[PDB]
Design a protein around this ligand. Structure first.
Ligand SMILES: CCN(CC)Cc1cc(Nc2ccnc3cc(Cl)ccc23)ccc1O
Ligand SMILES: CCN(CC)Cc1cc(Nc2ccnc3cc(Cl)ccc23)ccc1O
Length: 288
C-alpha cells in the first residue's frame, strides 16, 4: 500500500468527500462561535496591530472565520495574517477565497510557501524572533517531523497575552481506537504521524507549558464505505486508512476485519440508518 499523502490526486479528493460526509467544519465553526471570542479576548490589548500566524492554513476557510472573530473584538485594528503553507495549490485557493471575501480591507495577508519546519529554520537565522498575538495549527501536526520542537518553538513566538490554538483529533475519537487496534497492520509512514490530543497533552506536560483542552463531538458518515460498488465509499476508505487504494492494495483479511468492527460502538454510531464514525475533535489553547 502507499500512504495517501503520496498520490496527491486522491489525497485531495478523499479529503473533499470527507468534509462533505462529516461535521468537521461545523464542529470547528461551533468552536469559533462559542469559545473563540472568549479565548482571544485580550490578544489585541494595547496593540495597534494584531499579528496572526496560520500554520498549515489550507484554503483558509477556518482562517477567515477566526479573523472574523478577531475583528469583532478589535474593530478598526489592522490585522496581519501570515500563512505558512507548503502547497502552492492551497495557497492559490486561499488567495482566491480572500479575493472573493468582503470586509478584509483591515487585513493584510502573506503566504509563505514552506513547511512550519522550514519556516522555523528561516526565522532562527534572523537577527531576532518576531512575536505573534495568535498562532493556530489546525489539523496539521500529523505532518510535522518534530512535534515537541514545533510546540516549543511556536510557543516561544507568542507575545504578551498571546495565544496558540492547536486542533487535532481527540484521544477519545474513533481514530485513536482505529490506530491502536490496526496500527501494526500498516507499514511505516515517514509522511504522517498518527497522533491524538493524548500525545499532545503528554508532550505539553513534559514541556511544562500551560494549556487547556476542549473536546467537541464530530462525526464522519462512513455509510458509502459499506457498499462494494460506491465511488464515495472507496474514497472514504482511503482517508480513513491514510492509504492509497485501500480496498485494492490491502489484504482482504484487514479489509473484511475493519469493515466489521467499524460498525461497532467502539468506532461508530448508528443513527438514521447512517454509520457515524467518532470524529471527536480536540481544541488545545496554549498561553504565552
Ligand atoms: C492522518 C489523519 N487524519 C485523521 C485522524 C487527519 C486529518 C487530516 C486533514 N487534512 C487533509 C487530509 C487529506 N487530504 C487533504 C488535502 C488538502 Cl488539499 C487539505 C487537507 C487535507 C483533515 C482532518 C484530519 O482529521
Ligand atoms: N497510535 C495512536 C493511537 C497510533 C499508531 C499508528 C500506526 N500506523 C498506521 C495506522 C493506521 N493507518 C496507517 C496507514 C499507513 Cl499507509 C501507515 C501507517 C498507519 C502504527 C502504530 C501506532 O501505535
Amino acid at each position: 500500500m502507499r500512504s495517501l499523502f503520496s498520490d496527491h490526486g486522491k489525497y485531495v479528493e478523499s479529503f473533499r468527500r470527507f468534509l462533505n460526509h462529516s461535521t468537521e467544519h461545523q464542529c470547528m465553526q461551533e468552536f469559533m462561535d462559542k469559545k473563540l471570542p472568549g479565548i482571544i479576548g485580550r490578544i489585541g490589548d494595547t496593540k495597534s496591530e494584531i499579528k496572526i500566524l496560520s500554520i498549515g492554513g489550507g484554503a483558509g476557510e477556518i482562517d477567515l472565520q477566526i479573523l472574523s472573530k478577531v475583528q469583532a473584538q478589535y474593530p478598526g485594528v489592522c490585522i496581519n495574517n501570515e500563512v505558512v503553507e507548503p502547497s502552492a495549490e492551497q495557497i492559490a485557493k486561499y488567495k482566491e477565497l480572500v479575493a472573493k471575501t468582503s470586509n478584509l480591507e483591515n487585513v493584510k495577508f502573506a503566504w509563505h510557501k514552506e513547511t512550519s519546519s522550514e519556516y522555523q529554520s528561516r526565522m532562527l537565522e534572523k537577527k531576532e524572533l518576531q512575536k505573534w498575538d495568535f498562532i493556530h495549527m489546525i489539523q496539521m501536526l500529523y505532518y510535522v517531523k518534530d512535534i515537541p520542537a514545533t510546540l516549543k518553538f511556536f510557543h516561544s513566538l507568542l507575545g504578551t497575552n498571546a495565544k496558540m490554538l492547536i486542533i487535532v483529533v481527540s484521544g477519545s475519537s474513533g481514530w485513536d481506537k482505529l490506530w491502536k487496534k490496526y496500527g501494526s497492520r500498516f507499514p511505516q509512514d515517514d509522511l504522517c504521524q498518527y497522533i491524538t490530543s493524548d500525545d499532545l497533552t503528554q508532550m505539553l506536560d513534559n514541556l511544562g507549558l500551560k494549556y487547556e483542552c476542549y473536546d467537541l463531538l464530530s462525526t464522519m458518515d462512513i455509510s458509502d464505505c459499506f457498499i462494494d460498488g460506491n465511488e464515495n465509499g472507496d474514497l472514504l476508505w482511503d482517508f480513513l486508512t491514510e492509504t492509497x487504494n485501500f480496498n485494492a492494495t490491502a489484504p482482504p483479511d484487514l479489509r473484511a476485519e475493519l469493515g466489521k468492527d467499524l460498525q461497532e460502538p467502539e468506532f461508530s454510531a448508528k443513527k438514521e440508518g447512517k454509520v457515524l464514525f467518532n470524529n471527536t475533535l480536540s481544541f488545545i489553547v496554549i498561553e504565552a
